[PDB]
Design a protein around this ligand. Structure first.
Ligand SMILES: [Mg+2]
Lengths: 1316, 50, 50, 50, 251, 66
RNA sequence: GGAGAGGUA
C-alpha cells in the first residue's frame, strides 16, 4: 500500500471519514488559466485565438484589401527562468503570428484576388508563467491575483428606504452587457417606471416599450390581466374570477346565483372564494360604482360614425359607460388593478408618457442620447437599432447571457449576445413582480453573482485592448493607396501590444510582488481572490456587507483566512477543493447521494445551483452502505442550516476540510480554536521564517505533504529509478527500464538551487533527502526546499513548552525562552541581502571602481581585491567598503550601518562596449569554466547513461563480453551482431550520441555567446556590480515568534538552562508560555496540540529507549505496530508485517524524535484518544506533570501543563525594528528630519501625540519638539553647540515650515503677514 | 439562527457551527476596524473645538 | 436532549398548523435561550464549588 | 478569401514569405531564364528596405 | 530633485507654472500680432483655465493630469487635507533625538524607570556624550569624539552612565489616545535591543507585548527635563484624568 | 455642533488647520481678519510657548508687558 | 518627491 520512500516516516493519521476525492493540484487556477491563454484553440474561444478571431480579418475602408489571420506560435524564450532572474529581464516568449494580406484588383468586379501574400510577423513578447504560477517580470517573481468582480448580466436590486425620506423602497434593475451601454429601469417614488441609459436623462419605460413596435393595446395586453364586462338587459353582468378577490374589501351587496354570498363591510375571506368556486359562480351583478374608476384596455370606436369614443388606457365614467352602451358595445375590457398585488405601474407611466406612437418615442430617445443635432427619421431608427440590437456594438458574453437567462427562470443558457424584445419584456415583468410583492431582490455578495477573472482572462483582455490600436493602424495603412508593395510587417507594429501587455504584467494593481518567506506563503499568495483592482470596488469605500462572509462562501472561499486591518474580506482566499466553473464562477464538489446511498460520484455544484438542492453536512455518520445513522440530519437547503430527514438529502460534502483554505487547514485542532484566533493563526503561519534546520511538526494535519509538493520549492522526481549520484548541488537519477523513452534514452539530472535570496530577503536552498542508490518513484520528492523536512511542510520547530506564569517574564503575551534554544541554533535563520553599486555616465565622464580612494587606510582596503571589489567570503561588518568608487572632481558602496555578514556572491554586469576590469574577467572565466563543465558533465554522465544502455541490450543477440572492451566504448556499433531490431537500436541509441556530438558543438558556443556578451542596462548606467551578504540572525529578546493557533508574543528573556523549570527527570522546559492567554483568547486548540505533542514525544522517547540499548527488531516492530493502532476506528491502518526488516530500523530512526501525528481539520483526534496515546507511553494521562522550580529547587504547586507545541518564528525581527537618531539629514522643501529607517530619519511626533503634551502642562517640552528638535534651522545648530558646551537651553525662534506656509498662502492672491 | 451551537470549545465544533462562528467573528473584526476609523475622527473633532 | 425533544414538539405543532411561522421561530429562540441558561447555570454550579 | 474558395500556386520567396498566385492569373508565372535553376537568387518579397 | 537615475522628478507645481507662463506668453504674442477676436478669446479662456488649475486644481469642472491620469497638485492642495502643511508639517513634525523599538516586559523594573538598549541610548545621547568627552579632555575637538564614539571605546559607556543618570526619556505608543500615551521614564541601560516596559503602565498605554513598538524621545533642555520629571513621570500618573480611579491597576 | 462650533471661531488659524481650509481663508480674507494667538493650536502652528501649562506664566508676563 | 501593492500594532 505504501511506497519505498514514504516508509521513511509515516505520519499516524487520525481521522474517521474516508476520503473520496484527494486534494487537487493546489495551483490549478493559475496554471489552468494561463494554459487557456497560451494554447492553440481549434474551436477558437479561449486566449489568443479568441482575440485574433475577434479582431481579424481587418478589411480596408477603401475597399480593396484585407488582412486575415492564419495561426500563431510562441517562440522559444531567449533565456529561461534562472538567468532571467539573474540578469533582471522578463521571462517571455516572442509571439509570431502568420498574417495573410489579400489584395483585391481594381478592374475586376467586387471580390477578386489579384495577389495574396503571407509571412510570419512578430508582434509583442508576452511573459510566460513558470512551472509554478510565478512570472519573472524584471528579475522579480510576481503573481497575478485572481479577481472577484460583478458578472455581466441583469441585476435586480433596491435601496432599502434610504432615499427621498419617504421610508419607501425603490426597486431597480440594471442590464450590464459585457460590451455596450447599460440599461437601467427604476421606480419613481410615485410608483412610476422609468428607463435610462448610461445614467442619462431619465425617461418613462413606455418610451422604450413603444420603440419596439408596441401600441398601447399590446402594452396593456402584456402587462395586465383583463376583466370582462358584459352589458346585458339588467345591470352590468360582469365576469369575475373568484380568486381575484383575495385581499379586497367588500363595499356592496355581493350577490350571485340567487344567493347573497358576501355582504358589504367584509374583507373577502378565503372560504368566500372556496364557496364561490364550489357553487361554480363566474358572472356577477355589480353596481355602477365599481366601474366608476376602472381603466379601459383597448380602443372602442362606434361601429357607424367611426369616431373615437374612449381612448386606450382611459378611466371609465358613468357618462362614458352611457356612450359605449349607446354605440352597441357589449364586451368591455378593463385592467385588473390592486393596491397590493397588481399595481397600475404601467398605466401611470403611460399617463406620464409624452409620446403616443413609435416615431415620437424613437425621437425622444435620440434627443435623450445626443442633445442638439436636430433629429431625422433614420438618425433615430438606426441609432436605436444599433444601440441594443447590433452584434457589432452590443454583446452580452456567454456568462452574460447565462446569467440573463438564469435569473429570468429560463432554460436555454445560450443564445444571441444582443438583447431581444422578449428579454427587455421579461426584465420589466420581473421588476414589476418584485415591486408587487412576489420574489426578492438580488444580493451582490452572492458568489453566484460574482465572477473570477484569473490570470489568463485579464491578460487576454489587456492583449485585446492593445490589439485594438494595432487594428486601427492596420486599417489606416490598408486604406491608404498603393498596396502592391506592402507586406504584413510595414503596417503592424509590436509596440502597442508589448506596451499594453508589459503594463499589465509589470505595474498593475493585481500583478503584485510575491510573498516568498515560506512555501506556504507562495502557495497561498497564488490562490488569493482579491475583490479589488480594476473593474472592482475601492479599499476604503467598501461597506460592511461586502466585507462579511456570506452563506454562499461554504466550499468556495475560506471564511477564516483573510487579512485584518484596512481590508478584511477584500483579499479573501480560495478554499481547498474549490474550482472555477466554465463561466468563471466558483464551484465546489459534492458526492451525489441517491435514494439512500452516499455514492462516490462527484458533481461540482456552482454557487447558484447549490441553493436548489439540499446538501448534507460534512461529518454525518454514514456506515458501510451510504446510509445515514440518524433520521434528523443537519443540512443546508438555501443558506439555512437545519435538520432534515434521511431520504430527503440530494448531496453530501466531499470532505470535512473543504470549508477552509490551504493555509487554515494546516492548523491542528482547528475545531477547538476560535475564529479570530484561527484567522490570526493562518495569517501568522504565512509569515514564518525558514530556519537553519527544518523540523517536522509532531502534530500536523496531513495537508503538509500536499503543500510541500504542490509548491515548487522541493525538487521532485519525474520518472522513477535509482539514485545514481547525490551531491550537495545536484541529484542524478538513472531512470528505470520501462519509463525510459526509446529515443533519447538518457537519465534525469536535477540541479538544486543553493543559497539564493527570496523576495523577503530570506534564504531559499534545496538539500538532498535521498541517499546514494535509493529506489525513488514517480512523483516522489528528492530535495527538500526551504523549511520542509522529508518533503512535508515544516515552517518552524516543535518545542517543549510549559503553560505557567514565570516571574512576570511572560506577563502579557511575552515568551520565556531557554538558553539551550539558542545553544542548539534551532531558530537561527539566514537572511541574504543584495547591494548594488552602479556606474553612472555623468559629467566629467564615468567613475572608476578601483581601490584607490582618498582618506582610507589599509585597515579599510584590507578586504577589497586588486580591482576594487570585495573578496568572496570576506566577513564584513557595518561601515566597511564593498565596492570602492570615487567621485569625479568617495562614492564607495558601504555596508548599511548595522548589518554584518559574509559576502557569498558578487555579480558584475557591464554594458555592450565597455572594457572590463580583471575582476569581471575573473568571474567571467570562472563562469565560463562551469558552462564547459556543466555541459560536459551533462554529456559525459549521459554518455555513461547511453553506453550502459548500449551494453544493456547486449545481454542477448550478439554477446561477446571480452570483445566489448577490446575497442573502447566509442565504437560499439560495427561489432558482430545480427542486423535486426536490436541492431536498429544500436544505430538509434548512438544516433542520439551523434546528435549529442552535435549538441555539444553548438550549446557550449551559445553559452559563450551569453556569458561574455554585454548585458542590457538602463540609459545612464555603464556597469553594475552586485554584492550578496548572508547574515545569521540567531534569536534575541524582541523577536516575535508565534504558534499555529494565533498566539503571538515577543520573546522577553533568554533565561539560562539551570533557571528553566525541570521535571522529575531533569529535562528542562524549553519555552514557558502564559496560561492567561487561553481563556480570554479562546484558542483551546493550543492546549490539545500540547497534550498531543507530549504524547507524540512519548512514543519517540520509548523508541529512543529501544534503540539506545540495542534491542531486537521484533521488539521495535511490535511497539511501532501498537503505536499506529489505538485509534477509535481510524482509517490509517498500516501493517508493519509487510516491512522488509530494514525499513523498520529506518522507520524507527526517523521516529526517535517523536512519532508524527496527522490531525485532519475537522476529523481531529478526540480527547479520549489523546489520553489513550498518553497511556501507551508511560506519561501521565492528565497531560500535566509535577514540575520543579529551576532556581529555588523546590516543587511548583498545582501540576502544570507541559508538551511539545510547534512554535514558529515570524518575520518581525527586532534587528530590523530598532532605530535611533540624534541628528542626521533633513528634508529639502521643509527643514524637518527625514522619515524612515533606510533614510536615517527621526520619529514623527504627530498631531495626535501633540495633544498629549498640551493635556499635560509640558509647554517647554512641546516647544522644543516642534522648533528646536525638528524645524527651526537657526536654533537647532545653536542647540548642538549648546548641548556639547554643557548648556541645556534653547533659543527657539520660528519653525521653518511656518515660513513655507506663508510663502504658499502668499503664492495665491492672499496677503498674510505678521503684526507688530 | 434557530439552531444554536451546542458544542463548547473543549469538544469539537463541526463544520456548520464553525461557519456560523465565523459569521459572527468576521462581523466583529470588520466592525472593530471601521469603528477605529470613526472614533479617530470623532476625537479629532472634539479636540479641535475645545 | 430535552431542548431537542421540545423543539421537535414545536415543529410538530407547526406542521399541523396550530402555530404560525414567526411564532414558532420566536418559541424556538426562547426555548434555546432557556436551554443555554440552564447549561450555563449547571456549568457554573459544577465549577465554582467543585 | 472572404467566402470564395479558390486554387492558388504557392511560391516561397526570401525569409519564407509565401505568395499565392491564382491559377487564373497563371500567365505572370514565368519559368527561370538565367540557366542557374539550382543557383538562382531569392528575392525578398515586398521590397522592404529596397 | 533627481531620481538618481539621471532623470528629474515631476514637481507638479513647476508644470502648472510652466503652463501658465506658456499660455501667457502665447497670448502676449497674439496681442502683439493683432489676432482675430475669436482666437485671442479662446487663448484668454485657456489662460484663465491654466491660472485656475494653478491656484486650486480640480475645483473647476475638469482637473489636469500629469502622469498616469493622476491630477496635478496645485497650490491649494499643499494646504488642504492630511498631507497639507497644517496637518502634516505644522501641527505635528518629525523630531530629532528619537528612536523606536519593540517592547518587552522586564518586570524587575520600578514604576519610574524603563529599559533602554545600549546602542539606542548611545545614539540618542550622542551630543551629551560629546560634551562629557570634551569635559574630561579625552578629545580636544568634536571629530575625535565622533570617531571615539563610533569606535565605541571602553570609556564611552561610563560616559553614557553619566549622561543617563537623571535624564528621563519620553516613551510614546503609536496610537496615543489620551495623555497617558506619552510618559516620562528613567532609562536603565540594557545589553539588548528591546525597550523593556514596566508591566503596570501597560494599562495606561494599552500595550500588550505581542509585537508592539514604542518611540523614545529625549527631552533636551533643562525646562524639558524638569517638565518630564514633574508632570510626565510615571510615578505621577497613577490616576486617570477621565475619572479618579487608578490607572496603574495590577493587570 | 463640534464641526461648526470650531469653524465659527474668532481665530482663522484654529479653524483653518481644521477642515475646509479653502472655505475658511476666503471668508477670512475678504473680511480682513486678524488672529491674535489666543489659543493652544495656533501657538503650536507658529512655534512658541503654549498658554496653558508651564508656559502659562510666560503669556501673562507677555500680556502685562503690553 | 509621488503613485500602486502588501504587512505590524
Ligand atoms: Mg499589541
Amino acid at each position: 500500500v505504501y511506497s519505498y520512500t514514504e516508509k521513511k516516516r509515516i505520519r499516524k493519521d487520525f481521522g474517521k471519514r474516508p476520503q473520496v476525492l484527494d486534494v487537487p493540484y493546489l495551483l490549478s487556477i493559475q496554471l489552468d488559466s494561463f494554459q487557456k491563454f497560451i494554447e492553440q484553440d481549434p474551436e477558437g474561444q479561449y486566449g489568443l485565438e479568441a482575440a485574433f478571431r475577434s479582431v481579424f480579418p481587418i478589411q480596408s475602408y477603401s475597399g480593396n484589401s484585407e488582412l486575415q489571420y492564419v495561426s500563431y506560435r510562441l517562440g522559444e524564450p531567449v533565456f529561461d527562468v534562472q538567468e532571467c532572474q539573474i540578469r533582471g529581464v522578463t521571462y517571455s516568449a516572442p509571439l509570431r503570428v502568420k498574417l495573410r494580406l489579400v489584395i483585391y484588383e481594381r478592374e475586376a468586379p467586387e471580390g477578386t484576388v489579384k495577389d495574396i501574400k503571407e509571412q510570419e510577423v512578430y508582434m509583442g513578447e508576452i511573459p510566460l508563467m513558470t512551472d509554478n504560477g510565478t512570472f519573472v517580470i524584471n528579475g522579480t517573481e510576481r503573481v497575478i491575483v485572481s479577481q472577484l468582480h460583478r458578472s455581466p448580466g441583469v441585476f435586480f436590486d433596491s435601496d432599502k428606504g434610504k432615499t427621498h425620506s419617504s421610508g419607501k423602497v425603490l426597486y431597480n434593475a440594471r442590464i450590464i452587457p459585457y460590451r455596450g451601454s447599460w440599461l437601467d429601469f427604476e421606480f419613481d417614488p410615485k410608483d412610476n417606471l422609468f428607463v435610462r441609459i448610461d445614467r442619462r436623462r431619465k425617461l418613462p419605460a413606455t418610451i422604450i416599450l413603444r420603440a419596439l413596435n408596441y401600441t398601447t393595446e399590446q402594452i396593456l395586453d402584456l402587462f395586465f390581466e383583463k376583466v370582462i364586462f358584459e352589458i346585458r338587459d339588467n345591470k352590468l353582468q360582469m365576469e369575475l374570477v373568484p380568486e381575484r378577490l383575495r385581499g379586497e374589501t367588500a363595499s356592496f351587496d355581493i350577490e350571485a346565483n340567487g344567493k347573497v354570498y358576501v355582504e358589504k363591510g367584509r374583507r373577502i375571506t378565503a372560504r368566500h372564494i372556496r364557496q364561490l368556486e364550489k357553487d361554480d359562480v363566474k358572472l356577477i351583478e355589480v353596481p355602477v360604482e365599481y366601474i366608476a374608476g376602472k381603466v379601459v384596455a383597448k380602443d372602442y370606436i362606434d361601429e357607424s360614425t367611426g369616431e373615437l369614443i374612449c381612448a386606450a388606457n382611459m378611466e371609465l365614467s358613468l357618462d362614458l359607460l352611457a356612450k359605449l352602451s349607446q354605440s352597441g358595445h357589449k364586451r368591455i375590457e378593463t385592467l385588473f388593478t390592486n393596491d397590493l398585488d397588481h399595481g397600475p405601474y404601467i398605466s401611470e407611466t403611460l399617463r406620464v408618457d409624452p409620446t403616443n406612437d413609435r416615431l415620437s418615442a424613437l425621437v425622444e430617445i435620440y434627443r435623450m442620447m445626443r442633445p442638439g443635432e436636430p433629429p431625422t427619421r433614420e438618425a433615430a431608427e438606426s441609432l436605436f437599432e444599433n444601440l441594443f440590437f447590433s452584434e457589432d456594438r452590443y454583446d452580452l458574453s456567454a456568462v452574460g447571457r447565462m446569467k440573463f437567462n438564469r435569473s429570468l427562470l429560463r432554460e436555454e443558457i445560450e443564445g444571441s449576445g444582443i438583447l431581444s424584445k422578449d428579454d427587455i419584456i421579461d426584465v420589466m415583468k420581473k421588476l414589476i413582480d418584485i415591486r408587487n410583492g412576489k420574489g426578492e431582490v438580488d444580493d451582490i455578495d452572492h458568489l453566484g453573482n460574482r465572477r473570477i477573472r484569473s490570470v489568463g482572462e485579464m491578460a487576454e483582455n489587456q492583449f485585446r485592448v492593445g490589439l485594438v490600436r494595432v487594428e486601427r493602424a492596420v486599417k489606416e495603412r490598408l486604406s491608404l493607396g498603393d498596396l502592391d508593395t506592402l507586406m504584413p510587417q510595414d503596417m503592424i507594429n509590436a509596440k502597442p501590444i508589448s506596451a499594453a501587455v508589459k503594463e499589465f504584467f509589470g505595474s498593475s494593481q493585481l500583478s503584485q510582488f510575491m510573498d516568498q518567506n515560506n512555501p506556504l506563503s507562495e502557495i497561498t499568495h497564488k490562490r488569493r481572490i482579491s475583490a479589488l483592482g480594476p473593474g472592482g470596488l475601492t479599499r476604503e469605500r467598501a461597506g460592511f456587507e461586502v466585507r462579511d462572509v456570506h452563506p454562499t462562501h461554504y466550499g468556495r472561499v475560506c471564511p477564516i483566512e483573510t487579512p485584518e486591518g484596512p481590508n478584511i474580506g477584500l483579499i479573501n482566499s480560495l478554499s481547498v477543493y474549490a474550482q472555477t466553473n466554465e463561466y468563471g464562477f466558483l464551484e465546489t464538489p459534492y458526492r451525489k447521494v441517491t435514494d439512500g446511498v452516499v455514492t462516490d460520484e462527484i458533481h461540482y455544484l456552482s454557487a447558484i445551483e447549490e441553493g436548489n438542492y439540499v446538501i448534507a453536512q460534512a461529518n454525518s455518520n454514514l456506515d458501510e452502505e451510504g446510509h445515514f445513522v440518524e433520521d434528523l440530519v443537519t443540512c443546508r437547503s438555501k443558506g439555512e442550516s437545519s435538520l432534515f430527514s434521511r431520504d430527503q438529502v440530494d448531496y453530501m460534502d466531499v470532505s470535512t476540510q473543504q470549508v477552509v483554505s490551504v493555509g487554515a487547514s494546516l492548523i491542528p485542532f482547528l475545531e477547538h480554536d476560535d475564529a479570530n484566533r484561527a484567522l490570526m493563526g493562518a495569517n501568522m503561519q504565512r509569515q514564518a521564517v525558514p530556519t537553519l534546520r527544518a523540523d517536522k511538526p509532531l502534530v500536523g494535519t496531513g495537508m503538509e505533504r500536499a503543500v510541500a509538493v504542490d509548491s515548487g520549492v522541493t525538487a521532485v522526481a519525474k520518472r522513477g529509478g535509482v539514485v545514481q549520484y547525490v551531491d550537495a548541488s545536484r541529484i542524478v537519477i538513472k531512470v528505470n527500464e520501462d519509463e525510459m523513452y526509446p529515443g533519447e534514452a538518457g537519465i534525469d539530472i536535477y540541479n538544486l538551487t543553493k543559497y539564493t535570496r527570496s523576495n523577503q530577503n530570506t534564504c531559499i536552498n534545496q538539500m538532498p533527502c535521498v541517499s546514494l542508490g535509493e529506489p525513488v518513484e514517480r512523483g516522489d520528492v528528492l530535495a527538500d526546499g526551504p523549511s520542509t523536512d522529508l518533503g512535508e511542510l515544516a515552517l518552524g520547530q516543535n518545542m517543549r513548552v510549559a503553560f505557567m506564569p514565570w516571574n512576570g517574564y511572560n506577563f502579557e503575551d511575552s515568551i520565556l525562552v531557554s538558553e539551550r534554544v539558542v545553544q542548539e541554533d534551532r531558530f537561527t535563520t539566514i537572511h541574504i541581502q543584495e547591494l548594488a553599486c552602479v556606474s553612472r555616465d555623468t559629467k566629467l565622464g564615468p567613475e572608476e571602481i578601483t581601490a584607490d580612494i582618498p582618506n582610507v587606510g589599509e585597515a579599510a582596503l584590507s578586504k577589497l581585491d586588486e580591482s576594487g571589489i570585495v573578496y568572496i567570503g570576506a566577513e564584513v561588518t557595518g561601515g566597511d567598503i564593498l565596492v570602492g568608487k570615487v567621485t569625479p572632481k568617495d562614492s564607495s558602496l558601504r555596508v548599511p550601518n548595522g548589518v554584518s555578514g559574509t559576502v557569498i556572491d558578487v555579480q558584475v554586469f557591464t554594458r555592450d562596449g565597455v572594457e572590463k576590469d580583471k575582476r569581471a574577467l575573473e568571474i567571467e572565466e570562472m563562469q565560463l569554466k562551469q558552462a564547459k563543465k556543466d555541459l560536459s558533465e551533462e554529456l559525459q554522465i549521459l554518455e555513461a547513461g547511453l553506453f550502459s544502455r548500449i551494453r544493456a541490450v547486449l545481454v542477448a543477440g550478439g554477446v561477446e563480453a571480452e570483445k566489448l572492451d577490446k575497442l573502447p566504448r566509442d565504437r560499439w556499433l560495427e561489432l558482430g551482431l545480427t542486423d535486426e531490431e536490436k541492431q536498429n537500436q544500436l544505430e538509434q541509441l548512438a544516433e542520439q550520441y551523434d546528435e549529442l556530438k552535435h549538441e555539444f558543438e553548438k550549446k557550449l558556443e551559445a553559452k559563450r555567446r551569453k556569458i561574455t556578451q554585454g548585458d542590457d542596462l538602463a540609459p545612464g548606467v555603464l556597469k553594475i556590480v552586485k554584492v550578496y551578504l548572508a547574515v545569521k540572525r540567531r534569536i534575541q529578546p524582541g523577536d516575535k515568534m508565534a504558534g499555529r493557533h494565533g498566539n503571538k508574543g515577543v520573546i522577553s528573556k533568554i533565561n539560562p538552562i539551570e533557571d528553566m523549570p525541570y521535571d522529575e527527570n531533569g529535562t528542562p522546559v524549553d519555552i514557558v508560555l502564559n496560561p492567561l492567554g487561553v481563556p480570554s483568547r479562546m484558542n483551546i486548540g493550543q492546549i490539545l496540540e500540547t497534550h498531543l505533542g507530549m504524547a507524540a514525544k512519548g512514543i519517540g522517547d520509548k523508541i529512543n529507549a529501544m534503540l539506545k540499548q540495542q534491542q531486537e527488531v521484533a521488539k521495535l516492530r511490535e511497539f511501532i505496530q501498537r503505536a499506529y493502532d489505538l485509534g477509535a476506528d481510524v482509517r490509517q491502518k498500516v501493517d508493519l508485517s509487510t516491512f522488509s526488516d530494514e525499513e523498520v530500523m529506518r522507520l524507527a530512526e526517523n521516529l526517535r524524535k517523536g512519532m508524527p501525528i496527522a490531525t485532519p481539520v475537522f476529523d481531529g483526534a478526540k480527547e479520549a484518544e489523546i489520553k489513550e496515546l498518553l497511556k501507551l507511553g508511560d506519561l501521565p494521562t492528565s497531560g500535566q506533570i509535577r514540575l520543579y522550580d529551576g532556581r529555588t529547587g523546590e516543587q511548583f504547586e498545582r501540576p502544570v501543563t507541559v508538551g511539545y507545541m510547534y512554535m514558529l518564528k515570524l518575520n518581525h525581527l527586532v534587528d530590523d525594528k530598532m532605530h535611533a537618531r540624534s541628528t542626521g539629514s533633513y528634508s529639502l522643501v521643509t527643514q524637518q528630519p527625514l522619515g524612515g529607517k533606510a533614510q536615517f530619519g527621526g520619529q514623527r511626533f504627530g498631531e495626535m501625540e501633540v495633544w498629549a503634551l498640551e493635556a499635560y502642562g509640558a509647554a517647554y517640552t512641546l516647544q522644543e519638539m516642534l522648533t528646536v528638535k525638528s524645524d527651526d534651522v537657526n536654533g537647532r545648530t545653536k542647540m548642538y553647540k549648546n548641548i556639547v558646551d554643557g548648556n541645556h537651553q534653547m533659543e527657539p525662534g520660528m519653525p521653518e515650515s511656518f515660513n513655507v506656509l506663508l510663502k504658499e498662502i502668499r503664492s495665491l492672491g492672499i496677503n498674510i503677514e505678521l503684526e507688530d | 439562527i434557530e439552531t444554536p451551537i451546542t458544542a463548547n470549545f473543549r469538544e469539537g465544533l463541526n463544520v456548520l457551527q464553525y461557519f456560523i462562528s465565523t459569521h459572527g467573528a468576521r462581523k466583529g473584526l470588520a466592525d472593530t476596524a471601521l469603528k477605529t476609523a470613526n472614533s479617530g475622527y470623532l476625537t479629532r473633532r472634539l479636540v479641535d473645538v475645545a | 436532549s430535552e431542548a431537542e425533544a421540545e423543539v421537535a414538539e414545536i415543529q410538530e405543532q407547526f406542521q399541523s398548523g396550530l402555530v404560525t411561522a414567526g411564532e414558532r421561530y420566536n418559541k424556538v429562540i426562547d426555548i434555546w435561550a432557556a436551554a443555554n441558561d440552564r447549561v450555563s447555570k449547571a456549568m457554573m454550579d459544577n465549577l465554582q464549588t467543585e | 478569401a472572404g467566402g470564395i474558395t479558390g486554387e492558388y500556386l504557392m511560391l516561397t520567396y526570401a525569409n519564407d514569405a509565401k505568395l499565392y498566385v491564382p491559377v487564373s492569373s497563371l500567365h505572370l508565372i514565368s519559368r527561370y531564364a538565367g540557366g542557374a535553376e539550382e543557383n538562382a537568387p531569392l528575392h525578398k518579397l515586398g521590397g522592404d528596405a529596397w | 530633485v533627481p531620481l538618481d537615475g539621471g532623470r528629474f522628478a515631476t514637481s507638479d507645481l513647476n508644470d502648472l507654472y510652466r503652463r501658465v507662463i506658456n499660455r501667457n506668453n502665447r497670448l502676449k504674442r497674439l496681442l502683439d500680432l493683432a489676432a482675430p477676436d475669436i482666437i485671442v478669446r479662446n487663448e484668454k479662456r485657456m489662460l484663465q483655465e491654466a491660472v485656475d488649475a494653478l491656484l486650486d486644481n480640480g475645483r473647476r469642472g475638469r482637473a489636469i493630469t500629469g502622469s498616469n491620469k493622476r491630477p496635478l497638485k496645485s497650490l491649494a492642495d499643499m494646504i488642504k487635507g492630511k498631507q497639507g502643511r497644517f496637518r502634516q508639517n505644522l501641527l505635528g513634525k518629525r523630531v530629532d533625538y528619537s528612536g523606536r523599538s519593540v517592547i518587552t516586559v522586564g518586570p524587575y523594573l520600578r514604576l519610574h524607570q524603563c529599559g533602554l538598549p545600549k546602542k539606542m541610548a548611545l545614539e540618542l545621547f550622542k551630543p551629551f556624550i560629546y560634551g562629557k568627552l570634551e569635559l574630561r579632555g579625552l578629545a580636544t575637538t568634536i571629530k575625535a569624539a565622533k570617531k571615539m564614539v563610533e569606535r565605541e571605546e571602553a570609556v564611552v559607556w561610563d560616559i553614557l552612565d553619566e549622561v543617563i543618570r537623571e535624564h528621563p526619556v519620553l516613551l510614546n505608543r503609536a496610537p496615543t489616545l489620551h495623555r497617558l500615551g506619552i510618559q516620562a521614564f528613567e532609562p536603565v541601560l540594557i545589553e539588548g535591543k528591546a525597550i523593556q516596559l514596566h508591566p503596570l503602565v501597560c494599562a495606561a498605554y494599552n500595550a500588550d507585548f505581542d509585537g508592539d513598538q514604542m518611540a523614545v524621545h529625549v527631552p533636551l533642555t533643562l525646562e524639558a527635563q524638569l517638565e518630564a520629571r514633574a508632570l510626565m513621570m510615571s510615578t505621577n500618573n497613577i490616576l486617570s484624568p477621565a475619572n479618579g480611579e487608578p490607572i496603574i491597576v495590577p493587570s | 455642533g463640534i464641526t461648526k462650533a470650531s469653524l465659527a471661531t474668532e481665530s482663522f488659524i484654529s479653524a483653518a488647520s481644521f477642515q475646509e481650509t479653502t472655505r475658511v481663508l476666503t471668508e477670512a480674507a475678504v473680511a480682513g481678519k486678524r488672529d491674535e494667538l489666543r489659543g493652544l493650536k495656533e501657538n503650536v502652528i507658529v512655534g512658541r510657548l503654549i498658554p496653558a501649562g508651564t508656559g502659562y506664566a510666560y503669556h501673562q508676563d507677555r500680556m502685562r508687558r503690553r
